[PDB]
Amino acid sequence: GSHSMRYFYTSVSRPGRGEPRFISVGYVDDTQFVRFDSDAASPREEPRAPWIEQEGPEYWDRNTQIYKAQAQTDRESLRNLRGYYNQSEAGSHTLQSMYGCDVGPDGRLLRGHDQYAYDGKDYIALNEDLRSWTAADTAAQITQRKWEAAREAEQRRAYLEGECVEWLRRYLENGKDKLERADPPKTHVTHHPISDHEATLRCWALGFYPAEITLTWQRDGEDQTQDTELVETRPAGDRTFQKWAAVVVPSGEEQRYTCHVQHEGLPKPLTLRWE
C-alpha cells in the first residue's frame, strides 16, 4: 500500500522555570511507534509499538542524542522568534515541527514534508520541490535567509529522499501485517427510544485501523446527510479507532433506515440495519 512516516515535535517555553519542554512522537501511518520527553527522569527515545522493539541499542542511542540536540536547537529558535516578534521574555510560547515522507506501494518517495508553526500559526515550510521555502511573514523571512545561507533545504531533502524512505521501508518489513493489512470495523446498530413517537438509531464502528472511515445513514437508500449526528473518529487506546453515526427516526419506521460503512479493511462496503 501507500504509506507515510511523520515526526511531530512540540517545544514549549516556560521562562523562569528552566529550559523549554521538548516532546517528540513518531508515526508510521496512524500507528505511533516512538516518543521522547525532555522532562522524563532519564530522557531517551522509547518504543510505543511492538515491531520497533527489535531495533538494536545503536538505534535508540543515536535517536536519543538527536532529540537532546534538537531540544537545545528548539530552545535557541524560541529565543530568536520572541526577538523577531519583539515579544515579552516572561511569556510561554510554542514551536511545533512536523516532517516526514509519503511513499507509494513500490516504496518510492511521493512527497516530502518539513514545516513549522509558532504559537499555532504556520511559520515556515519546505516546498514540495524540497529546494525552496514559504515564509509566513518578515520574521519567518529572517529564518528563510539564515536557512538559504546554511543550505538547510539540501540537508532536509537528503533526509526525506534517503533515511526517511529507507527507514519507513524497514518499519513496514518489520511491522508486517500490523502496518500493511487494514483491520476492519466490528459494527452494530443500537436503538434508543426518545418517546412513543421518536427513536435514535446509532451505527457503531469499533476496533478499526487505519482511522479513515465513512459512516452514512440512508432512508430507502438515500443519504440522510442533513439529519445524521456523526462523532469525530476517536482512539480506542489499543491502536484502533471508533466512530458512530446516529439518526432520529419515527417509531415504527426503523426498517426504512440502513447504515453504510466504507473502510479499507472491509472486503466490500457494509449495509447494516437494526437487527
Binding site: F8, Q32, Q96, D119, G120, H192, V231, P235, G237
Partner: protein, 100 residues
Amino acid sequence: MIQRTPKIQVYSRHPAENGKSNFLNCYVSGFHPSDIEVDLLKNGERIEKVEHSDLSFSKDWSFYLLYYTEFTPTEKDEYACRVNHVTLSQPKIVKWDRDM
C-alpha cells in the same frame, strides 16, 4: 495568540458490560496551546491511576491527548471527564454515557 477550545469525548474502549474490566477514555482534541488539565472522575471524585497518550497534533497544529484508566463499569457508578484550558471560563465536565 492562537487559542483553540478543546473538543471532548468520553467513552469506553469496549462496549460496557457491568462487572467486566474495561478502559474509560477521555479524548481531548483540537486545542491550542497544549497546557491542559484532564481528570477522570468516579462519582465526582478524582481517579488517581490515570495515564495519557504522548502529546501529538493534527495537520492544523491543534493538539490531541487520550486520558484513560482501567475500570469495571457497574449500574450505579457515575464516570465523567473534567477539562480545564485557558479557553474555558469554567471546567468542562462531560459525563460518560455507555450508549455513546
